[PDB]
């Protein structure tokens, strides 16, 4: 499930990068891009229990799958820019490659979010992988 878009847990344990900030977008998406690395964005609402619910499971895969940079942003910090970011729902994910959608997930869907991360660690280019 999801909430249309606050207890104290971590959405940001493990390899997950809390962004807060603008400049923390721009600086870890300048590392993506320079590093060649695919970037799962997690728009998510601490009230939200969707995003709750599915954040330990995004911390675990954060561990598992360090090829690809994980970050959370807390659509109520940021919230001029996940407007400009037309998130509707909460948790939303944004599969970024250089900042453009290579894939996305809306909802707290454990397998699927799994499933795509290998997916799309698979279809790099050699020069990537």
């Known amino acids: 499930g999801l909430c249309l878009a606050e207890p104290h847990i971590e959405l940001a344990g493990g390899n997950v990068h809390l962004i807060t900030t603008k400049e923390r977008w721009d600086q870890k998406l ?7 690395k695919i970037v799962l964005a997690n728009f998510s609402a601490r009230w939200c229990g969707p ?6 499971y995004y911390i675990e895969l954060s561990e598992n799958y360090p090829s690809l940079m994980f970050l959370v942003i807390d659509v109520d910090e940021l919230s001029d ?13 944004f ?16 397998p699927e979010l799994h499933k795509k991360i290998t997916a799309i660690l698979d279809s790099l280019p050699p020069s990537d992988k």
Do not use: C, H, M, Y
């Open 81 to 93: 820019f996940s407007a400009s970011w037309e998130i509707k729902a909460t948790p939303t994910f």
């Open 95 to 110: 599969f970024l490659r250089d900042g453009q959608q290579v894939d996305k997930l809306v909802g707290a869907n454990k």
């Open 51 to 56: 995003s709750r619910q599915i954040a330990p």
């Open 30 to 36: 300048s590392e993506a891009s320079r590093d060649g």
